[PDB]
């Protein structure tokens with residue numbers, strides 16, 4: 001679990017979105033595993049606007065943050081779940097690091113701000129859904 005709070009918006013993994021998130025829906029993209037809902041309070045998280053490939057993510061299954069090198073956002077094949085059939089997920093970045101399904105939503109940050117949230121991982125892997133291209137989050 002985990003979410004980004006910026007302005008009048010809440011960014012969550014689409015597969016973890018609640019009934020409240022869907023009744024206050026602003027935008028969703030199944031191919032990215034992202035959903036954005038509107039909120040009654042103002043958020044102060046800062047979204048990074050950069051091409052950083054290094055940062056730190058929160059891993060809830062270890063109660064720890066880990067520094068990682070991560071790939072550029074791209075279409076990567078992801079295996080099936082009760083949430084999705086096997087498919088290409090877009091705007092996804094991989095790093096070598098620990099992750100388990102309940103780790104989805106943990107934030108990845110660089111010196112410029114929030115980069116994305118955990119959404120994948122594998123055998124050692126871990127994947128992050130990028131949010132840096134969502135320029136409208138700031139306005």
Ligand SMILES: CSc1cccc(CN2C[C@@H](C(N)=O)CCC2=O)c1
Nearest residue numbers: 033081083099100101119120121122
């Ligand atoms: C086996 S480690 C791991 C870590 C994070 C996530 C997963 C698998 N997964 C993929 C998600 C997606 N983005 O399609 C949907 C929900 C889900 O459980 C495995």
Ligand SMILES: [Zn+2]
Nearest residue numbers: 050052110112
């Ligand atoms: Zn950066």
